[PDB]
Design an enzyme around this catalytic site. Structure first.
Site, PDB file in Angstrom:
ATOM      1  N   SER A  28       0.841  -1.193   0.000  1.00 38.39           N
ATOM      2  CA  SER A  28       0.000   0.000   0.000  1.00 38.39           C
ATOM      3  C   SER A  28       0.880   1.248   0.000  1.00 38.39           C
ATOM      4  O   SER A  28       1.705   1.420  -0.903  1.00 38.39           O
ATOM      5  CB  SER A  28      -0.941  -0.010   1.206  1.00 38.39           C
ATOM      6  OG  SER A  28      -1.674   1.199   1.302  1.00 38.39           O
ATOM      7  N   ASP A  42      -3.116   5.256  -5.637  1.00 36.15           N
ATOM      8  CA  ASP A  42      -2.098   4.693  -4.764  1.00 36.15           C
ATOM      9  C   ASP A  42      -1.405   3.557  -5.508  1.00 36.15           C
ATOM     10  O   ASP A  42      -1.698   3.291  -6.680  1.00 36.15           O
ATOM     11  CB  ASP A  42      -2.695   4.270  -3.414  1.00 36.15           C
ATOM     12  CG  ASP A  42      -3.739   3.160  -3.528  1.00 36.15           C
ATOM     13  OD1 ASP A  42      -4.158   2.823  -4.654  1.00 36.15           O
ATOM     14  OD2 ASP A  42      -4.151   2.657  -2.453  1.00 36.15           O
ATOM     15  N   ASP A  76      -1.106   0.218  -5.426  1.00 31.46           N
ATOM     16  CA  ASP A  76      -1.833  -0.968  -5.882  1.00 31.46           C
ATOM     17  C   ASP A  76      -3.129  -0.592  -6.593  1.00 31.46           C
ATOM     18  O   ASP A  76      -3.931  -1.471  -6.942  1.00 31.46           O
ATOM     19  CB  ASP A  76      -2.085  -1.915  -4.704  1.00 31.46           C
ATOM     20  CG  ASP A  76      -2.953  -1.308  -3.592  1.00 31.46           C
ATOM     21  OD1 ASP A  76      -3.053  -0.074  -3.427  1.00 31.46           O
ATOM     22  OD2 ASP A  76      -3.544  -2.101  -2.842  1.00 31.46           O
ATOM     23  N   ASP A  82      -6.096   0.469  -5.986  1.00 35.74           N
ATOM     24  CA  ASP A  82      -7.495   0.300  -5.604  1.00 35.74           C
ATOM     25  C   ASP A  82      -8.113   1.587  -5.058  1.00 35.74           C
ATOM     26  O   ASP A  82      -9.327   1.615  -4.817  1.00 35.74           O
ATOM     27  CB  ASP A  82      -7.674  -0.852  -4.601  1.00 35.74           C
ATOM     28  CG  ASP A  82      -6.831  -0.696  -3.342  1.00 35.74           C
ATOM     29  OD1 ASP A  82      -6.068   0.275  -3.236  1.00 35.74           O
ATOM     30  OD2 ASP A  82      -6.922  -1.584  -2.459  1.00 35.74           O
TER      31      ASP A  82
END
Ligand code: G16
Ligand code: MG
Length: 448
Positions: A97, A237, A239, A241
């Site tokens: 993250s 961000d 990743d 999502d």
């Protein structure tokens, strides 16, 4: 004690002392014992240690007789999508993250990409891993590489009518995370002109760890929008999502207002549907959902609660103010890609700027933004606030912390489930002065 890397919703920790290859292998063994029958999808983000942690996960799964479907470098939503699409037993995304450079982690799901959280199997896995001193076994199942994104890309594109799209100029800012790979695969099928910022995946993060909420990182997207006359800008961000929107003036749009906007976009395609929303900020979402013919459904915040409620209600869309947007046909999962496709379609079809799509809503329901407080005694601080306002007799709701509705203003005050903090959100009925005075009053009470 207990392994600190196991959190409420996922695994997160510094490597190698809180998370390492041996722990990752043991997690794979323990996960195999928790899933129904079938193979396990694995993907990873751009962090330097993520491939090795994934390989260790795979080794433990295969030692336990699980076939592994390796979808490679990807976003978190791709693990969700492929787990559900391939009818896998479960999946794990290896991702850190926006934690520091020495950190990594894992997000785990079972069938249909249903979350595995602390009370639905993650602490069972933790306790198994904690007690497991067994010698590593050898693999009894195979690994297949499946990097084809066609089904995923077709799914994303199915949310828009491509013939109605205009050649908007869009800033895209992957922050050297993974989002640019998907943008580039979508671009041949879209008429947009992309302005690519921090676009190449680089786990060394030369421009900072991807986090568009940090003002320094925010300004890079804002500047690119203004300097290039873009219609709007999008940042993710690492990743991807989570997605973050900037209008043509470079102004960052608070995520609260995207919930109501995306709900209207979806309700145009699926009329009369239910829309799930969190309790932190509510009034604008309830109104925009109802005005579009939808049914708003209040839900405790956090993806596990949101997804469960959406499933039980057959809800078409769910959204949190914290930049998480969930879509029924997308395995009830969150996507950082579907939202900007829907917004681009809205701008194209309506002839209105992103700024105009939200301007009146922001004036009608101004909000404080989420303000966090680290205090010596959270329970005593909350009591000080509630005691101060008791004589006004607010309407109280305990869906998620304390919500207090005073008529022309309301607040939500929560303990975080991912951090030892109090989080405050305030909004008013078109009154920016009331917003500031009440926000400052509550802030003083909390700090006292
Ligand atoms: O931070 P993320 O992106 O992993 O997201 C996680 O934490 C957020 C904040 O939770 P809290 O306010 O209790 O700290 C939640 O809204 C989100 O649904 C959850 O998946
Ligand atoms: Mg993320």
């Amino acid at each position: 004690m207990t392994l600190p890397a196991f959190k409420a919703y996922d695994i997160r920790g510094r490597v190698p002392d809180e998370l390492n290859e041996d722990l990752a292998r043991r997690i794979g063994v323990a996960l195999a014992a928790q899933l129904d029958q079938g193979p396990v999808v694995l993907g990873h983000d751009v962090r330097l240690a993520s491939p090795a942690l994934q390989e260790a996960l795979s080794a433990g799964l295969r030692a336990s007789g699980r076939d592994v479907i390796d979808i490679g470098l990807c976003g978190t939503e791709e693990v969700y999508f492929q787990t559900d699409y391939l009818k896998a037993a479960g999946g794990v995304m290896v991702t850190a993250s926006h934690n520091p450079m020495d950190y990594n982690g894992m997000k785990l799901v079972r069938e249909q990409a249903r979350p595995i959280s602390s009370d639905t199997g993650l602490f069972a896995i933790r306790d198994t891993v904690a007690a497991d001193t067994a010698a590593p076994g050898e693999p009894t199942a195979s690994e297949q590489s499946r990097t084809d994104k066609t089904a995923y890309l077709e799914h994303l594109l199915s949310y828009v009518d491509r013939s109605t799209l205009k050649p908007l100029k869009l800033v895209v800012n992957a922050g050297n995370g993974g989002a640019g790979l998907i943008v580039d695969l979508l671009a041949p099928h879209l008429p947009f002109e992309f302005v690519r910022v921090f676009h190449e995946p680089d786990g060394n993060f030369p421009n900072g760890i991807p986090n568009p909420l940090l003002p320094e990182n925010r300004d890079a997207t804002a500047k690119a929008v203004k300097d290039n006359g873009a219609d709007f800008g999008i940042a993710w961000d690492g990743d991807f999502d989570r997605c973050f929107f900037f209008d043509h003036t470079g102004r960052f749009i608070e995520g609260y207002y995207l919930v109501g906007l995306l709900a209207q976009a979806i309700l145009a395609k699926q009329p009369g549907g239910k829309v799930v929303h969190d309790p932190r900020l509510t009034w604008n979402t309830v109104e925009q959902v109802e005005e579009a013919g939808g049914i708003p459904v209040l839900c405790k915040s956090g993806h596990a609660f949101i997804k469960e409620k959406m499933r039980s209600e057959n809800a078409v869309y769910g959204g949190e103010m914290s930049a998480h947007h969930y879509f029924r046909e997308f395995a009830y999962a969150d996507s950082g890609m579907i939202p900007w496709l829907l917004i681009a379609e809205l701008v194209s079809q309506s002839g209105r700027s992103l700024a105009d799509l939200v301007e009146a809503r922001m004036q009608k329901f101004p909000c404080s933004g989420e303000i966090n407080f680290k205090v010596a005694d959270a329970k005593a601080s909350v009591a000080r606030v509630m005691e101060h306002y008791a004589s006004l007799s607010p309407e109280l709701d305990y869906t998620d912390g304390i919500s207090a509705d005073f008529g022309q203003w309301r607040f939500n005050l929560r303990s975080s489930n991912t951090e030892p903090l109090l989080r405050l959100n305030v909004e008013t009925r078109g009154d920016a002065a009331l917003l500031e005075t009440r926000t400052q009053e509550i802030s003083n009470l909390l700090r006292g």
